[PDB]
Amino acid sequence: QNEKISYRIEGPFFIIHLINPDNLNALEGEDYIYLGELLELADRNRDVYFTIIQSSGRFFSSGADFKTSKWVSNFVARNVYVTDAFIKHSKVLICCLNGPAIGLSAALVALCDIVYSINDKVYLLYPFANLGLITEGGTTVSLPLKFGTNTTYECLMFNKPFKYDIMCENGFISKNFNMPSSNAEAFNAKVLEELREKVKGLYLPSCLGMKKLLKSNHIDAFNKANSVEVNESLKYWVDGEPLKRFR
């Protein structure tokens, strides 16, 4: 197991927690892999109906941690594995956004089923054009779907944040808790307090039955997207440009 990311179960809630606020929860390849496996884990567990993903500090995650060298063949394997696990996960994926997210970790927020926000200073940022890359983590599908093509084009092409006012206008954030971003702990605990309230009286196997159908609406497109995003990425690595621009 891993000291940047913890997890526990709590009735129907399998809870994953990024516990490295000092480093703005930047994640390395093996961290993304681990995160992928925790989902595989919650997904086998027959008592779990909701995978909640929380973080810490002032950022949800600043994304990739930057510290023949086909280290990029791991970078790529990273993308595929973790993106696959989200796309396919059958439990209801909930993300507690305690601050900005960037890069692949931002793409993963966009694959979650429900998102809640600590306050209105949150944003998602996809700096691909800036690092001479293209879309990853299913964003080809996930961004236009959840924010619209024209907004997606404005943000991706010109490396601009999908800010909070955009998130509400498109219903991306299912609720804002409007709390200090000093206290991520209380926000994460407030969310789970309410989740515990909302599930009372429900028949949870219905939720999974319902996700099973809703998921079918785009599952093929999500997978197609993951596949072709990776293929086309290689054209960009072999050119070399991404590397020069890691500085």
Instruction: Provide, rounded to whole angstroms, the least separation between the CB of residue 29 and a second copy.
Output: 22
Does the annotation list 243 as a binding residue?
Answer: no
Instruction: Provide, rounded to whole angstroms, the least separation between the CB of residue 59 and a second copy.
Output: 21
Stretch that binds a second copy, among 51-59, 80-88, 96-104, 126-134 (CB under 8 A): 126-134
| x/- map, 85-124, a second copy, by CB under 8 A | -------x--------------------xxx---------
Give the burial string for 127-140 (b: 16+ CB within 10 Å, else e): ebeebbbbbbbbbb
Is 136 marked active-site? yes
Contacting residue, 11, 180, 209, 240, with a second copy by CB under 8 A: 209
What DSSP string describes 38-100? HHHHHHH-TT--EEEEE-BTTBSB--B-----TTHHHHHHHHHHHHHHHHH--SEEEEEE-S-
Residues in the chain: 247
Decide if residue 211 touches a second copy (CB under 8 A): yes
Q: Please measure the distance between the N-terminal and C-terminal CA atoms of the chain and give it in whole angstroms.
A: 31
Report the relative pairing of strands 13-18 and 175-176 from DSSP bridges.
unpaired
Decide if residue 170 touches a second copy (CB under 8 A): yes
Does the annotation list 234 as a binding residue?
Answer: no
Q: At a CB cut-off of 8 Å and minimum separation 6, what does 222 contact? A: 87, 111, 138, 141, 142
User: Which positions are catalytic?
Assistant: 136
Residues engaged in binding a second copy (CB under 8 A): 92, 113-115, 128-135, 140-141, 144-154, 156-160, 166, 168-175, 198-199, 201-207, 209-214, 216-217, 221, 225, 228-229, 232, 235-236, 241, 245
